[PDB]
Structure formats: C-alpha cells, structure tokens
Ligand binder design. Structure first.
Ligand code: ATP
Ligand code: ATP
Ligand code: ATP
Ligand code: ATP
Lengths: 578, 367, 379
C-alpha cells in the first residue's frame, strides 16, 4: 500500500484538495452507505465534470477539517492507483500477491476506506490465461463481507457499458447519483474555490465576473456540465489575465474578461462589437448594394437580422435569422447570400438541395442510425455547423428537396439545434439561414386567359403556402420577394460584368475600355425581364469575350496592347483594337 | 414494507438482498440519528425514505415545500402561457395525482398529446412545466426519426453492430433522469414504427434497451406535441359562412395515431387559437423579454400603453398564434434599438422612451 | 499563428486541465504549431512563462513496442509520467492523440494510456499538448467524455492567402537549400493563388507548399544536364497545371494552333451544323484564353434536333479532337426519379452506400473532360 495508494487525509490536510462546497445530500448518502453492515461501499455515478471525485476526495477534506459525523471522524481514505499494481508485475502470481497484500493492509487498519476512481478500470490484470478478473475475483468477498469499505467513482456511460456487466460487482456497492448543480450552487462553488484561482493566478475576480461566468457558460458552452464548465471560464480568464502583468497590466478580472473568454471558448464573438466592427457592420448594408442591384429590401433584411444579433437583441435560441428568398431566376437570390458571407468575413456553408430528392437523403444531413453502414460518417449538415458555428448557411433551391427534408429545419429554425446520429447537437444560433427558391415563379410568369390580364403577383399565396407546411412558414423571419430586374439595374449589371471582364483581362497584361454607347447597346440588347441578369453574361460573352479570345489566343491582342471597344451608329456594331 | 416496496421500486436486483439493503440502509440511517441523541427504531416511514432514495423517486410531499410549489403550479404557468388553461390544468392534475399517490402502477406520470393551431404554446407550456417543477427536460425532435431504421438511435444498435456501445438516446436519457418531463416534438413527423416504442412505454412505463436493461418512465411526464390537423384547421371553406374545422382536425389525428395509441394517452388536448386579450398579454410578455435583453447592456426601456395597444392590434392574426408577435416586436422595437445601440446614442446612453402619436401611429424613440 | 499560440499558452498557464488540444483539418499546421512552439521557446520568441520549458514529443509506437508480459506497458507508461512530473517544467506533445485511447490494454481490461493519464491532467500535475483532426476528434475524443474534459480544444483554421504567402516566404529558404533552387516573388505568390483556384481536397498551408516543393524538385532535376535555373511563375504554373489539367501558360505555344484549327478538324467530320461547331469551339477558346466563368463549366450546350444530324457525333469528335476523355452518361438509364442515387450515391446507412456515385467519380477521375449526356429528355 505504501507506494500504491495516496493517503487523502494526508493530502487534504497538508496540501489541500480544494474545498468541497455544499453537496450535503450526496455526502449524507455516502456516509449512510459507508455506515451499512454489509456492502457498505458507495459508488458515485454521474456525468463527467459534476464533482464525483470532488466529493469522494472532498470527504477526506471534511474529515481532516473535522466537519464530519464522529462516526467518520478519524477514518482514513486512501486513493488507489491501479496502474501501479501492474507496473510492479511481470510473471504469474505477482499481481495477486501484491493486490491481496493491500487488502490485508486495509483490513488491518480497520478504519479506512479505499477510493477507487475510474472504477470501471479495475476490470483487468488477468491476461493470456485470465479468468481472474481482479475487479471481482480478488474483492467480491471483501466487499460483501463488510471487511473493507470502498468508495468508487465512474462516468455514467462507463458505468452502464462496462461497470455494469458484472452483476456480482453491480450488487456489491450502493449507487449514488451525482447530478450537476444549478446556477446558484455553481456560483457558491466558485466562490468557495475562487481563493485558489486568485492565489494561483495572482488575480482577483469581481462579483460580476463570477456571476457572469456561470450564466454565460451555461448559455454558450454546451458540452460540459455546470460545476466544471464555469470553472474553465474562471481559470481560463485567470490564466489570461496573468499574462498581462508581463507588460505591467495588473488587473482584477472583470465581467469583460469573462465575456471575452466565454466568447472565445464557444467561438461566438462578443466585445469587438464595441470596436471597428461597428463600422464593418454599419456599412454592410451598403457594400452589398454595390454587388446586388435592386433588391435593397433583401439586403436590408439580412443586414437587420445581423445587427439585432450583434446589438444583443437577438433571440435566445434561434438562428440569427431565417427567411426564404423567392423570385424569378437570375435576380440575385443566391448571389446576395454568397456576397453576404464574403462581406461579413465568415464561412459560407452551401448545400444544394437538389441533391436531397428522396426522403432517405436525410441521412446525409444527420448520419446513419447506429448499427448501420454510414454510421461513423456522421451527418453533413450537422457537421458543417459544428466546425463553423458562425456562418451563413445557404440551402439552394430548397423547393427541390423532398418535402420531408424540410422537417429537419423545424427544430433548427426554432431552437437553433439539430441532433446528429451520435447524439451531439449542432448549434445554429450564430448561423444565418437563407433558403432560396423558385417556387411560385412558374405561375407568376403565366399569362391568363381573358380580356384583362390578371395580376399574378400572389404566387406567395399558393406555391409558397402549398409547398411549405404552416409550421415551417410560421418559423421564418421573412419571405422576401426578389423582383425582376429593371432596365436601370441592367445597366448596373452590365457595368458589373464588364468590370469582371476587365479583371480577367488585366491578369493577362491587357486592358479593356468600353465606350458608354457600347455599354448601353449591350444592355439594351441583352435585356430580358424573364431571365433577370442571367443572359447579360451571355451577351457580354458573345459581344466582348469571343472577339477577345481570338485576339488573345492568336496574337492580335497579347503583350504590348490594349483594346478599345466602341459602338458605331450606322450598324450599331462594336469596334476593337490594340 | 422493505419487501413489498422494494419489489415495486427497485428493479435491477433480486429480492433477498434487494429488500435487506433497504433494511440495512434504514438501519445505518437510524444509526446516524442518535448523534443528536435521538434514539431510533425503524418505522415504515424510514423504510419509505430509504426506498425513495434507492429508487430515485419522490417520498412524501405534504410537509414539504413541494406542497406549496405544487399547489400553485398552475398559477405560475398561467403567467407564462396565456389562455389554454385546460392544458395547464391537465398537466398539473396529473402531477398532483402522482405526488398524492393516486397514480398508476406502471405508467408514466401522465401522457398527453398536444394538438392545435400553430403559434399556440403547445411546446411552450411543456418547456415551462419542466422549469416550473425544477426538473430535467428531455427533448426529442421527432422530425429526426423519419425512417423505419431510426428507431435504433432511440434504443441502440443490436449487439455486435457498429452502434452498440453508444446505446440508445432515449433509454439512456430516461435512465439518467427518471424524474423528468419528456417532450417529443412534432411526433407526427416520426416514422410510425416509432409509435410502437411509445405504445409500450405508455402501458408499462418501460423500454428495454440494446443492453437488455430497462428504462423506467414511471416518474416521467410524457408530452408529445403535434401539428396533425393544422393544415385543415387553417383551411377556409367554400361558402358564405366559414366552418369550424376543429372537428376535421380530429379526424386527421385519429388517422395518424391509431386507437391502440390513443387509448394509452391520458388525454388529447386540442389547443385553441389565441384571442386578442391573449395577444395583449403576449405583447407584454415579449416586451419584458426585450427589456431584459436591454438591461444586459445597461439600457432601460419604457413602452407606453398606447404603444402596446398598437403593437398588439397590428400583429394579431388568429391563424398564426403568437409567433408573429415577435416579428412585430422586431420591426417596431428591436430594429430601431439595434441602430441606436450599435451606432448611436445608446451605446453609453442607457435609456429609451417609446410612445406613439395618434396622427401617424408612429413610435418615438431616443435617449 | 500568433493567436493560436496565445490561446495555447493561456491553456498551458491554467491551474488545472492545462492541456490544449489542437484540432483542425488535415494539413493546416496543427503539428507545425506544436513544434513551432518548441522552436519559439528555443529562439526566445515566447513569453518568459514558456521560456526555458521543454516540450517532448511522444512516440506511441516505441512506448508500446516490446511491452510483452503483464505489467511492462504499465511500468513504462508510469515511468514516463513520473519523469515528466519530476521535470516540473515540461510539456508532453502527442501527435494523433486520439490514438492514446487505443493504447494496448493487455486483454479484456481497461487499463491503458488514457485511463492512466486522466488523473494527472485533472490535477494539473503534467501538461500535455494534443493534436488531432476534426474527424478523429469527433469519432474518438468526443466519445471519451472524461478524457475530453481534460483538454482544451483550440480551433485551428486554414490561413488566408496573404498568410500562406508569408509562411512560404519564411519556409522558402529551406526548399531553396534542399533543391538547390531559388524562387521568384511571382512564383511564390502564384503558388498560393493558383493552388487556391485549382487544387481541391487539401488546405492552403499544405496546398501552396506542395507546389513550391514540387516546382523546386523539378528545377532540382534540371542542373543534372546543367540546366541551372530559378523557379519562376511559369514553373509554378506548370506544376499546378499538372494537377489542374489545363495550363494557363502553354496555351501560348503550339497549343494555340491546335486550338485554332479545332473548328476545321470538326467541320471536315461533321457537315452542316457549323453553328454547333462554333458554339463548342468558341467556348473552349474563351476558357483557354482565360475568359472563363471562374466557377462554372467550360460551357453547357443543349443540342437539339432531327435525328441523324450529328448531335452526339460532334461531341464525340470534340473529345477526340481535343485529346481528352469522353465521359458518357446515357440518360435513358435514369428514367425515374430515384435513379439519381446512381449518379451521386446512396445516403449513409443504405445498401450500396459505399458503391460510389457514377457522375461524381467520373468527374473526379477526369477533371478535364467532355461530359456527354445522351438523350437528356429521356431522363
Ligand atoms: N462541491 C465541489 N467540490 C469540488 N469540485 C466541484 C464541486 N462542485 C463542482 N465541482 C467541479 O467539479 C470538479 C471537481 O472535481 P471532480 O473530481 O468532482 O470532477 P468529475 O465530476 O469527477 O469529472 P470527471 O468524470 O472527468 O473525473 C471541479 O471542476 C470543480 O469546479
Ligand atoms: N441585382 C444583381 N446585380 C448584379 N448581378 C446580378 C444581380 N442579379 C443577378 N446577377 C447576376 O446573376 C448572378 C447572381 O446569381 P443569382 O442570385 O441571380 O442566382 P439565382 O437567383 O439563384 O437564380 P437560379 O434560379 O439560376 O438559381 C451573378 O452573375 C450576377 O452577376
Ligand atoms: N399562451 C401563450 N402565451 C404567451 N406566449 C405564447 C403563448 N403561446 C405561444 N406563445 C409564444 O410562442 C412561443 C413559442 O412557440 P410555441 O412553443 O408555442 O410553438 P408550438 O406550440 O410548438 O406550435 P408549432 O410548432 O406547431 O408552430 C412563446 O415564446 C411564446 O412567445
Ligand atoms: N453532320 C454529319 N456529317 C457527317 N456525318 C454524320 C453527321 N451526323 C451524323 N453523322 C453520322 O451518322 C451517325 C449518327 O450520328 P449522331 O449519333 O451524332 O446523330 P444524333 O444526333 O446523335 O442522332 P440521335 O437522335 O439518334 O441521337 C454517326 O455515325 C455519324 O458518323
């Protein structure tokens, strides 16, 4: 035992193991179990990071501090490192001699408790031959006879998958469920532990820093439990603050440092909103109007959703915003979204919904159910939002997906979550959801029969309503109708496309000038309300790019020249040059 | 009592030692009593306390603060969910019976199907119930169980398969939290094979997982929500008089959930549409949420009564429930505030006054 | 990678569970950073807190190698940890840290490297820097919750274009030394820009570097015939083009005439329908000229008409004339809605999941190709 276990009273008394705060009921049972006539061995079972070891060792602390029932007073708790019982072995029989020697020592002390953490690891030692499991074979009678007292500890999952197969062991200890504290209990736990962080990091925490670490961690960090989750924030903020005095920036850790840390851990930005990001955001609405012409209202809706979220007036558990972009083809429905993600500097997660035409294609978003082929793959959607929690999520031509696929978004739009096939949750609260569609267009573009042409603008009233179930629609922030582009827009579109052409040419060492007459001509020639801005690229392709490709490819316009294009008036034909 | 209670509440061990353990812990418990110098014998009440602790169930509520918490549970919920009183009452009645002891031998605390128009707090009330009671909410978006084979994610892969150690997500959630509110959202979206899992739960309080262990739902409140019948509810009839289609919505529910399912529910509660009175309450609720969000930035907010009356009058839509009201709040209050909070006077300001004129019915703003 | 290290240091500086885990896509510099810190410590490019501390890199294979008998592994494992605990100013670094979870427990037991490490991380006794990909982190580290709680995940993203150029400028001298080459400024900038435009299934820090290394390696085989030269943008372009399959610079050579005469080689084979020939010929020329569509296909043209008029023959002849692969897809075989899974594959969990997807594999194998979809109206 001398070099296999740790005397926890000795440790708790001299170095300290950090105080245990609260957990009155947890200890009440542990003691009542330890006080039983037989099988007086509690097992602390729970979610990782809830204080299972904190309690098991915390008991040693209470004993050395005298804060125990006299029954427990003066008893010694020893923690066993089973790794050391194997490190000292090699051939047959040495393990058992060593293992039993420790048991004899516990029996001889008579007033001691052994603590075995990771209790599910006591299964082992036997190998090659085996059948002698250690875990049960060397201790079943020790536990059932009351000769020794053992406190164990385990993760709830390990407990059911491993620590629960051996019924004989399952029967020999009383399980105590350690659940995670609530907000207040977490705050008091921090206050009790706080002096150790302040002492370790040479920092001090404000009342708000502590209050906030708990509330913020709960809201933003969701893969850990409260008592160790809020601590990471406090400890991390401490470690960060400790790196300031290096430039003499000695300071108290305040709520501002906590928010910076939570924001970094959760990858959700929070303080830059007060800095230059105010202008990046302020100007967002206009940068996008230089890329998508017309459609200002779509730009505003996106811009507004983002501003509210950055302002802090977002929702508590919804995507940044979620609206469907409907309209005629070639009017900037996907273009504004692509540009939004560029303007914001964030990842664009683009899915083509045309690929999800069968009901069973949902498995590509979620992953196969356990037990199936594609299980370890995970889901493509849930994974995309996990790697990039701050993103623009674009679902192109959503009306092409099998309609049951839309059901996947009900919980996304409403709770910001989606659960993958491993049970992990996607978190969409920092994702802008944009879905585009051509629903209703075929109808809006149809001519009616009669003397008076009917106004078919109520496409929203039929196709959008028939395609998207009421519960889907009622979760959208908006349904935004993109219009056909006007001729004023076409002129802007043509200018835009010519610039794109100029850039491709600049990269080849040549440049292009187009006269205004030539531009107006191309705009006038290509406009077709029905196809939006889509054909303008073809008009440019035929009137400017084809001529240029011949000049670029066969030597007429290569190194040494530039091309000027002008329109004549007689034929309205374009000129070219060098 | 140790013997007859252990067989009812402790189900992972055989009787000899299962009952002795109750006796032994009760013994130890009583042994730790005369430290206060109060000598004890072990009565039925001490046995019941031990079983309650071993089985992870509630003991006796009348002398507890739980008595008061339970007594006015309906009142607190009515402050969060307006209207739909009958749903609130059904939930609290089932709970009271269970704590009263007038429960079921082997069934969930109660089992309800929440049906009705959208935007009505079918989900909202369940979420608040778990908060009001202080217990874990176990959620399961049923839209994610659309294929016959998705059942294995609820109960785990069969042994020997790639998803065998993961276990089931449902049985594990229940095992970890035996006393909980279990919410199955949009249950009608799940593949019907899923309902077969629910039928046995509703009748026995239990599911066997892929490890052969059982989840005990005896202390779980089971609420599942649905939109079955909504498209029909919102349909307008042909004629001069619009018809009440709630009767057809039920026909839709009865086609999705077969008699075998329906007979295992304690109730099917058809939630009604929200009234204008409710909207006024809803608007105040949303404004308060806004005020809280603003307080977090150090900004106070006043909204006049007329501004409230107007927002409520503007946003009400009987068919869409309360969800649109939040849209009204975003456009009339949050957007203006975001600009002031982000680029203007409220950054280090801290105050905003909102009222409207009568001539334009436009809102005021500013520090 | 200043911020990536700032966080790593802040994690190492924590009181407990001060073990950063570097998680990211492959080829993004995760291990470059962990080794980079050892480099910075030695060079004095780190806070005094890290200064003078030793980072050791663990060979899991040598730790497990030879551990026969019951107890040798456990002994070696513990000896290592003891040595680290007695150093008091060291950090252990583990590549592919998810593999520690698979350390050899001898038999049916659970005593292995992860179970033996856990208490020393919780206690703050030792410091470990881990490294794993987002996929290995998800399928391995994410599952062992207790171990995962002892690491602080650092999210390492792919660098920008400007950042990639800068790492090349820093790394460059070693490629120059290794290959006996020198790289021009244009060569470096282009490796990054071109790799971004043309090389898929890789991340920048690696993608640009791979081009620099190969181009250096190409030039390394020139002064064997004493064709000594530097690596210019043209050589970088050639290397990327090897992968991209359509060079932007060779278009200026004999390729100009191969392309110029394309229209006539096709007119002599397909008669009438000159307009189809022109449509195809022009699309290619623009694409080779550089007047492409940035992200769209070379061109997409529906050929409609009476039978026996050369609609598929001209496309077949095009692929022949160009010297490129013809990918054929008979649309009549996709006569039903569900037949789409033949083109892209079955969803995960379904029979045939690992069979592939005919269209996506055809295109992936042959990036430069003519894709012909016969009788599209029959799909
Ligand atoms: N009363 C408490 N005493 C000590 N620690 C507590 C307490 N309550 C919560 N904690 C938190 O839990 C941790 C205490 O250590 P503990 O051994 O209990 O972890 P754990 O719950 O067993 O997690 P794991 O399964 O990974 O070992 C600390 O992070 C601490 O912030
Ligand atoms: N308002 C606009 N300003 C400038 N260019 C535009 C505009 N609208 C469309 N375009 C042009 O069309 C493209 C933008 O993509 P767009 O959003 O129109 O796709 P879409 O609306 O989804 O149509 P589809 O039905 O084919 O998917 C760009 O090439 C862009 O030059
Ligand atoms: N009776 C109510 N009182 C106040 N707010 C309500 C009420 N009912 C619904 N709401 C509003 O709805 C919001 C939550 O939506 P809810 O949970 O009710 O949708 P649902 O019941 O699931 O219906 P569906 O999903 O079919 O659209 C609440 O935050 C609340 O603002
Ligand atoms: N314009 C042409 N000039 C010379 N030969 C030709 C022409 N068209 C077709 N042919 C010949 O006739 C045969 C059929 O040609 P092809 O398959 O390309 O026509 P198609 O448009 O595909 O008809 P289908 O409607 O059946 O698909 C080929 O062997 C081809 O050599």
């Amino acid at each position: 035992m001398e070099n296999f276990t740790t005397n926890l009273n000795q440790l708790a008394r001299v170095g300290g193991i950090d105080p245990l705060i609260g957990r009155e009921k947890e200890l009440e049972r542990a003691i009542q179990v330890l006080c039983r006539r037989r099988k007086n061995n509690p097992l602390l079972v729970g979610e990782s990071g809830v204080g299972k070891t904190a309690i098991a060792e915390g008991l040693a602390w209470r004993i050395v501090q005298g804060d125990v029932p006299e029954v427990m007073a003066d008893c010694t708790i020893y923690s066993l490192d089973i790794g050391s019982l194997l490190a000292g072995t090699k051939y047959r029989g040495d393990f058992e001699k060593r293992f039993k020697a420790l048991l004899k020592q516990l029996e001889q002390d008579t007033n001691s408790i052994l603590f075995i953490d990771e209790i599910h690891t006591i299964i082992g030692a036997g190998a090659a031959s085996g059948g002698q499991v250690d875990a049960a074979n060397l201790i079943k009678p020790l536990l059932s006879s009351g000769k020794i007292r053992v406190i164990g500890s385990t993760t709830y999952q390990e407990f059911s998958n491993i620590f629960e197969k051996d019924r004989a062991l399952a029967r020999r200890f009383q399980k105590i469920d350690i659940t995670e504290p609530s907000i207040e209990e977490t705050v008091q736990i921090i206050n009790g532990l706080k002096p150790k962080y302040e002492a370790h990091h040479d920092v001090r925490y404000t009342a708000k820093a502590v209050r906030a670490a708990v509330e913020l961690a709960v809201k933003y960090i969701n893969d850990r439990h409260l008592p160790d989750k809020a601590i990471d924030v406090i400890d991390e903020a401490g470690a960060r603050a400790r790196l300031m005095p290096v430039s003499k920036r000695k300071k108290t850790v305040n709520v501002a440092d906590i928010e910076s840390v939570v924001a970094r851990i959760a990858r959700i930005p929070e303080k830059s909103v007060s800095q230059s990001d105010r202008d990046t955001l302020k100007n967002l609405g206009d940068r996008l109007k230089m890329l998508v012409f017309g459609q200002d209202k779509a730009i505003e809706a996106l811009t507004e959703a983002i501003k509210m979220a950055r302002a802090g007036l977002g929702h508590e558990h919804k995507p940044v915003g979620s609206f469907l972009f409907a309209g005629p083809t070639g009017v900037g429905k996907t273009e504004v979204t692509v540009q939004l993600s560029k303007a914001l500097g964030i990842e664009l997660l683009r899915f083509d919904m045309s690929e999800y035409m069968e009901r069973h294609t949902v498995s590509r978003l979620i992953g196969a159910p356990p037990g199936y082929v594609g299980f370890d793959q995970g889901g493509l959607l849930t994974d995309a939002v996990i790697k990039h929690p701050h993103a623009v999520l674009l679902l192109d031509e959503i009306e092409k997906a099998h309609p049951d696929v839309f059901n996947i978004l009900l919980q996304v739009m409403d709770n910001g979550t989606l659960t993958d096939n491993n049970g992990r949750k996607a978190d969409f609260r920092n994702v802008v959801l944009v879905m585009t569609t051509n629903a209703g267009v075929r109808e809006t573009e149809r001519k009616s029969i009669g003397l008076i042409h009917q106004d078919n603008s109520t496409d929203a009233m039929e196709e959008i309503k028939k395609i998207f179930t009421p519960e889907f629609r009622n979760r959208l922030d908006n349904i935004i109708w993109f219009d056909h582009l006007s001729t004023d827009v076409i002129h802007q579109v043509v200018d835009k496309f010519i610039v794109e052409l100029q850039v491709q040419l600049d990269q080849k060492g040549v440049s292009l000038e187009v006269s205004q007459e030539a531009r107006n001509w191309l705009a006038e020639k290509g406009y077709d309300r029905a196809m939006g801005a889509r054909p303008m690229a073809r008009v440019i392709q035929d009137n400017l790019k084809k001529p240029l490709a011949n000049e670029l490819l066969f030597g007429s316009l290569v190194d040494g020249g530039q091309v000027t294009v002008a329109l004549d008036k007689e034929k309205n034909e374009l000129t070219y040059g060098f």
